[PDB]
Design a protein around this ligand. Structure first.
Ligand SMILES: *[C@@H]1O[C@H](CO)[C@@H](O[C@@H]2O[C@H](CO)[C@@H](O[C@@H]3O[C@H](CO[C@H]4O[C@H](CO)[C@@H](O)[C@H](O)[C@@H]4O)[C@@H](O)[C@H](O[C@H]4O[C@H](CO)[C@@H](O)[C@H](O)[C@@H]4O)[C@@H]3O)[C@H](O)[C@H]2NC(C)=O)[C@H](O)[C@H]1NC(C)=O
Ligand SMILES: *[C@@H]1O[C@H](CO)[C@@H](O[C@@H]2O[C@H](CO)[C@@H](O[C@@H]3O[C@H](CO[C@H]4O[C@H](CO)[C@@H](O)[C@H](O)[C@@H]4O)[C@@H](O)[C@H](O[C@H]4O[C@H](CO)[C@@H](O)[C@H](O)[C@@H]4O)[C@@H]3O)[C@H](O)[C@H]2NC(C)=O)[C@H](O)[C@H]1NC(C)=O
Ligand SMILES: *[C@@H]1O[C@H](CO)[C@@H](O[C@@H]2O[C@H](CO)[C@@H](O[C@@H]3O[C@H](CO[C@H]4O[C@H](CO)[C@@H](O)[C@H](O)[C@@H]4O)[C@@H](O)[C@H](O[C@H]4O[C@H](CO)[C@@H](O)[C@H](O)[C@@H]4O)[C@@H]3O)[C@H](O)[C@H]2NC(C)=O)[C@H](O)[C@H]1NC(C)=O
Ligand SMILES: *[C@@H]1O[C@H](CO)[C@@H](O[C@@H]2O[C@H](CO)[C@@H](O[C@@H]3O[C@H](CO[C@H]4O[C@H](CO)[C@@H](O)[C@H](O)[C@@H]4O)[C@@H](O)[C@H](O[C@H]4O[C@H](CO)[C@@H](O)[C@H](O)[C@@H]4O)[C@@H]3O)[C@H](O)[C@H]2NC(C)=O)[C@H](O)[C@H]1NC(C)=O
Ligand SMILES: *[C@@H]1O[C@H](CO)[C@@H](O[C@@H]2O[C@H](CO)[C@@H](O)[C@H](O)[C@H]2NC(C)=O)[C@H](O)[C@H]1NC(C)=O
Ligand SMILES: *[C@@H]1O[C@H](CO)[C@@H](O)[C@H](O)[C@H]1NC(C)=O
Ligand SMILES: *[C@@H]1O[C@H](CO)[C@@H](O)[C@H](O)[C@H]1NC(C)=O
Ligand SMILES: *[C@@H]1O[C@H](CO)[C@@H](O)[C@H](O)[C@H]1NC(C)=O
Ligand SMILES: *[C@@H]1O[C@H](CO)[C@@H](O)[C@H](O)[C@H]1NC(C)=O
Ligand SMILES: *[C@@H]1O[C@H](CO)[C@@H](O)[C@H](O)[C@H]1NC(C)=O
Ligand SMILES: CCCCCCCCCC
Ligand SMILES: [Cl-]
Ligand SMILES: [Cl-]
Ligand SMILES: [Cl-]
Ligand SMILES: [Cl-]
Ligand SMILES: [Cl-]
Lengths: 337, 337, 337, 337, 337
């Protein structure tokens, strides 16, 4: 009678669960139960190129109607303790491409159950998931990546369960609040479709993000040191050819430094078999510094016999090398921009 | 009758739990249940700039009244075994910004339940939580950070549960006992407010700390080596210009050392896209050592033709370079202090 | 009666589980129960040479008939909630060579149960497993590896349980969709056999993959830098012998760089006691650069007394060293290809 | 009747647990229950300066009397299966300063229960705990550390539970068998006291160890290389001043090596804001090598104009530098010993 | 009646468990129950010198007789589902020196129960354990290690439980199949004894392995580079004394390289306070390269005044240094072999 009478509410809930079979889906043997899904993305923790995965924390909500749970006489929505979910049928929703995921359990299990008079159930979970994402690093670090989150029913086919994004394109929220230091979220999309397997067709919901990497870090960390070393190798041109130790030391250090930069960066990334965009720039800078050392070797080889010709090579090297390196940067950056 | 009669106490507790429904909150269908919260901060384990999070261990206590648990005839507060909490309704309190948290369980679950004659429940938990904290590292390592701990109800709106800091500004204790080697806790604040969501308004408690980083470590580790290398590059000025190998080796090593210091430090920090305060100092020191090597290259280029002019440049470099570097430190440190 | 009548379905399922003993296998005391197995390989996460193991995520399905679960009057296959598996006998299938494995449990346990009127049970699990794989690295990085997944019954002998690949060679799917950046899957095989132990013979299913490592990464990371350093050591031949500091510095840096490359790479791999194919190439490159430094030491030792003979050695070194190194690469690569 | 009659023993144990309330402590509402504690330290796994904690594995035993468990007619102590502990009241003992701990569970839970006719309960647990320990590293690596293990009741005040070390100073055993490669256990102490909190006074047991670090590793790893580099810088004194490249290279390498040693060691330790004892020695060695390079710079600056004075400075540097460095070691080591 | 009649088998098993008390050991209050143990070692995953432990995966089987489980009328051994073990008494066997261990649980718990008509129980577990092993590294890497696995009863004394190796020396199998890249298993032993504690004597089973480390890896990784650097320092002897920069650079690089090799290797090993066998060789190689640099310093100090004597020292250094180093290797290797 009275909504505030807890004895009446307790009796109503007890009647719903009496004879309730968790082993059977709602409308078992009839039309498939439609499950609506919304995601409130709390944050994207990290994006790992080494492991080809990203970590996602979100509020995962499922919406479906179970006529066995319909109640009358209480004009209110019943928000029950989360432990009642273990006594109710829930969809066997799982993430297809996840690698490791869990539900937060402090202070209690991060779970909520809300009932409605018509029998509709609101089921929410706070989940941190690590989802695999294959990334094409050919244009790294100027690449754009597309990481998805595939949602599917594990055991029920389309004849038993159907999926849909509740709210259309507004089903997923919080994308604008995601703060990735290395990436920017250009766009997100929602896809609903059915996938055919050997046992039958299964419902599928896809949430995908298009990530564009920020180049500001790589300019300061990799590109600028490579340019400075290349400019450092040009100092040998203005050094007199009689300074054999000084000019060879300039050639050796720049060549060795360029190799260390190229090798050290590649160790951080996964052992991919192809060449990246940054690798092309690093290998190009290696050629310029290597030719600078070979330039003095040619000069040192003819400086005694032909001092006039050796001086000309040094004088022209002060112009060709800076100009060719500028040309190399022009074609390189225009291609990848 | 007798408080020391365990049979009477057992019968009283059994009567309280007979017909008790854990699925229903206290005063279900009526006024919201007010939950008072106090925190005894045991320690702050670590503050991670790489992961943008901090680890917090604390005693989390919740205070609320459940009239179903009121008992008479026993003029004492009943401290029961912690396993009785699984038979009682508890608030669905969770931490909004946490990444991973757990309740200690040695030797038993670090949990306590205390009942009172009027039905009030004291519920304590010892929790270690890792909470995300976005940090602005533009002024690193001279930056000040503000890390919060957001407390919210997962399933109940403000019409069912209300939050408040029990004791006002004295609800959180142990802040003065926190020992962070790298940070000092300038201030902590307590905020109580309601946050509106799609499903309704939810109670929210916020505990925030203002952390000021200690610069003593970074002076010894990064700033002093950068200064010493810059001073090391000034030694080449007093070396005779005929020592081409000696002066170029001084120029090469200082330039290469400066690059290694700048790159090695940045690897430890997360790959942020902007420039930090320490990066500005490191790049400034790179210019001074690079110009020192270019100074000898100009001298070596004219020393044979114009020995008098070359000697003057070395003599003036012994004054301009130390003085300009002192000026650079003056403007740099005043801006960031 | 009606398939859509949930009360009739619930009564039918209750009758099946009444008197059902999970402790007894189907046809206990009679013919062994045949279990058919299919694997849908989701992905191969990584292949670790250091730990000698690989990570596999797959859909593991088991097929067997339990006459105690046969039902009549319902012309449909009963897809039940996954929690019904705890009330049914399941095979004690385990992976012989696994190191750590788990079943995904978000949002629910990644498990499915499907019943059939004749009593057949379909039991599916989504499992991520780390399986040990001993790898022979003598031809590393040009080696080919064979990693297996051994499937066995833990407690039942062949008199109680029998294994077979359901579908023959088509039992395992998704191999073509596996994307390993460092490896290519040449072939996979399915083996069914019985293994004799002290307690008796046990059923065994083997799934093996033949992996061929991609050499593209190692050419860019290890082979090319080794060649460049060796070519770098040849520059000293064109440098005049009077440049003692320049030519010795070329000899020292190349020798030290070669040692660092050989040692740094070997640290990543496990501390195997034998010599790898890459180690042979690195040691061969060390000899060439070491002899180049010794070449100038001989020249520097006789340049004053016999300038004509010293000049000849430098002139011939410009031909013998590039030609011998080319010969060394020819025999090396042909042997390992 | 017969002690070997298992039916009589089973009936006796069943009578004890009939009507037993685990929610109520022994002598509830009366005098506090006294709990005696003994520790058998299996080992101390590691001591971490970075994390400021140590790992401890021990046998934790609790002794208390529960008159509800008193039995007659069996003149023996009942060693029961460990699973009976879940049906009995146990103290809510927890470790105040622990960070992560667990009870071993292979093959069964590492737990034992022993009953006595008067009702006394022996409760043992094998626990591996990681306990926080703040360490003062000002005298590192010649420092002495004091790490404690605080034992407290989580929910019961002194009016309900009391703690004491069973056996006095002999309560903790196995300290002499602890093998720490880096530390030696000078002394251990046992403290029993009551700590006052907001909710009341709580029992507290403290076990502390005084650890003295072994300097043998640091002499071989850090101190000796620093001395050798300093002695290496003295070789430049005997080199002729005309060898500008040779003497500057000696100065550069020693100065750079000293910086690398100081920076590399400090990275391993936590980012403390103060100066350690080892840092003082490393900075002192930096001054000597830096002055050695500056010594030649002064000599090179006046060697042409005043060859006689330049030779004297080199001759005196061969005596002052070795003697002053010996003096620096004398005052340094005496202060810290 | 019929062995294939599952109803009769189910009734027989139900009778065994009716009135069965898991809290009481077999023959409680009488003679101790004898438990026979066999181990089938699957593999030894790794041996860690840093953590002083090894990882072991094995099949652990326990054999004992429980007359309460004796059955008649079924002339077969009952292999039951593994979940029946939770309804039976099992020995409280635990590993004394383990650090972390677990039982595999995919697809089900890796556990088996086999009953026999006389009441004997076969209990098998697949366990991966990490067991602590103190290692003496004085002769590292030419050392021999002895790692054990101590097996004990946690709560029952020798008056209640007794241990023995079932099969004598054949109780442990699979030792010959263990493949350790760094170690070879010389011998394994089985020990059965009783250990006296404060509460009484306890049964103990010990399984120990004698491991001999393979030196092949360390020859290629540490010993050969040390020899090559020492030989590299001998090149300076053939360089003319006028090449001050060349010979000092040879001296500096070899001395610095030797220090880096000694320090880098020691970082991998735990911070032990004593000197290892490899450290003795590395320190010996440091003396030879350091004396080589000091040899030229003496030559450079007298080359102008006494050119004849300086030439003799270089000539004799080409013989004494190679011969003394060969002598040093002879005494070193003979002592440790
Ligand atoms: C990251 O990468 C993934 C994988 O490539 C992208 O996911 C794809 O997204 C596109 C949309 O951008 C999807 O295309 C759409 O599929 C819908 C579902 O298809 C099912 O139903 C149709 C019949 O209606 C069947 O033919 C089909 O086989 C499926 O069963 C379609 O309904 C959509 O059609 C709409 O758009 C087209 C034009 O594109 C119109 O012509 C139609 O009239 C209609 O308006 C559309 O085809 C595609 O299916 C997704 N692939 C997968 C594997 O999920 C992500 O978008 C990408 N991330 C980002 C940020 O770009
Ligand atoms: C780390 O960063 C966080 C986020 O910026 C800071 O948290 C903020 O802290 C300030 C206080 O320092 C909060 O401001 C206060 O909010 C209270 C609650 O607001 C609710 O109720 C009011 C109506 O009463 C509504 O208008 C509002 O929308 C909310 O629903 C207010 O009650 C406070 O008002 C009091 O102070 C103001 C002056 O500041 C007076 O004018 C008022 O009369 C009154 O006395 C106040 O506005 C703010 O809400 C917090 N933000 C968040 C997101 O939590 C942390 O403080 C910071 N850490 C540190 C150490 O600085
Ligand atoms: C690592 O660091 C910790 C913290 O500093 C040390 O722990 C301290 O150890 C000392 C003993 O060495 C403790 O001092 C002793 O405390 C006992 C308990 O005090 C309670 O009871 C007294 C009244 O009896 C109250 O006044 C007090 O407030 C407490 O409620 C005392 O009983 C002891 O007194 C005995 O010794 C003194 C002389 O020291 C005599 O005068 C007395 O008559 C009596 O014989 C004593 O005072 C101290 O409390 C510990 N502190 C903490 C925080 O636990 C560790 O010892 C250290 N580790 C090592 C190896 O040194
Ligand atoms: C790694 O290191 C461990 C520890 O040192 C070694 O373990 C020891 O192994 C030896 C055998 O190699 C053990 O010695 C044997 O102990 C048996 C049990 O002793 C109990 O019973 C006797 C009475 O029978 C009591 O005196 C004793 O206190 C114990 O209660 C003995 O029965 C054995 O005796 C047999 O051999 C001796 C000769 O050695 C004969 O004289 C006897 O007649 C009889 O045949 C024997 O003494 C020793 O106990 C083990 N120690 C521990 C701590 O377990 C490992 O062997 C080693 N690993 C390897 C590979 O070497
Ligand atoms: C229940 O499952 C069985 C087994 O998958 C189905 O039987 C198969 O049905 C397909 C067509 O859907 C046939 O091609 C196969 O030959 C059948 N195999 C067997 C062994 O019968 C059965 O159809 C399913 N029941 C329903 C109602 O779909
Ligand atoms: C509350 O509901 C119960 C069950 O219908 C009823 O017995 C009780 O009288 C109600 N309470 C009031 C105050 O009406
Ligand atoms: C303790 O309380 C029980 C229940 O009321 C009662 O039966 C018993 O007599 C009491 N004990 C005493 C000593 O009064
Ligand atoms: C559903 O089945 C139950 C059990 O047989 C039966 O009592 C009930 O009447 C059936 N429902 C209908 C609509 O026939
Ligand atoms: C063992 O004790 C039970 C319970 O008292 C009794 O019924 C049984 O007869 C006893 N057994 C013997 C052999 O006396
Ligand atoms: C199987 O055993 C049960 C229990 O003894 C019995 O009732 C049943 O008749 C037996 N079955 C057959 C076919 O004899
Ligand atoms: C290692 C390659 C060196 C090339 C030197 C070319 C010199 C040409 C002189 C005519
Ligand atoms: Cl969590
Ligand atoms: Cl814990
Ligand atoms: Cl998972
Ligand atoms: Cl464990
Ligand atoms: Cl496992």
């Amino acid at each position: 009678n009275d909504p505030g009478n807890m004895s009446f509410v307790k009796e109503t809930v007890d009647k719903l669960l009496k004879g309730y079979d968790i082993r059977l889906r709602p409308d078992f043997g009839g039309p498939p139960v439609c499950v609506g899904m919304n995601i409130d993305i709390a944050s994207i923790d990290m994006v790992s190129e080494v492991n080809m995965d990203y970590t996602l924390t979100m509020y995962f909500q499922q919406y479906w109607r179970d006529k066995r749970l319909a109640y009358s006489g209480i004009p209110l929505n019943l928000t029950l303790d989360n432990r009642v979910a273990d006594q109710l049928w829930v969809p066997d929703t799982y993430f297809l491409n996840d690698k490791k995921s869990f539900v937060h359990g402090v202070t209690v299990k991060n779970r909520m159950i809300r009932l409605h008079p018509d029998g509709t159930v609101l089921y929410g979970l706070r989940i941190t998931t690590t989802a695999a994402c294959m990334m094409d690093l050919r244009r790294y670090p100027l690449d754009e990546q597309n990481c998805t989150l595939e949602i599917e029913s594990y055991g029920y086919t389309t004849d038993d369960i159907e999926f849909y994004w509740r709210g259309g394109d507004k089903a997923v929220t919080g994308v604008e609040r995601i703060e990735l230091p290395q990436f920017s979220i250009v766009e997100h999309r929602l896809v609903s479709r059915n996938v055919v397997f050997a046992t039958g067709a299964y419902p599928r919901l896809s949430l995908s993000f298009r990530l564009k990497r920020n180049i500001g870090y790589f300019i300061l960390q990799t590109y600028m040191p490579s340019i400075l070393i290349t400019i450092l190798s040009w100092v040998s041109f203005w050094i007199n050819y009689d300074a054999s130790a000084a000019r060879v030391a300039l050639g050796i250090t720049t060549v060795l430094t360029m190799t260390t930069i190229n090798t050290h960066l590649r160790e951080t990334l996964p052992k991919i078999p192809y060449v990246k965009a940054i690798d092309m720039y690093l290998m190009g800078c290696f050629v310029f510094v290597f030719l600078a050392l070979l330039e003095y070797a040619f000069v040192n080889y003819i400086f005694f016999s032909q001092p006039a010709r050796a001086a000309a090579i040094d004088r022209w090297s002060r112009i060709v090398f800076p100009f060719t390196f500028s040309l190399f940067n022009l074609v390189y950056w225009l291609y990848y921009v």
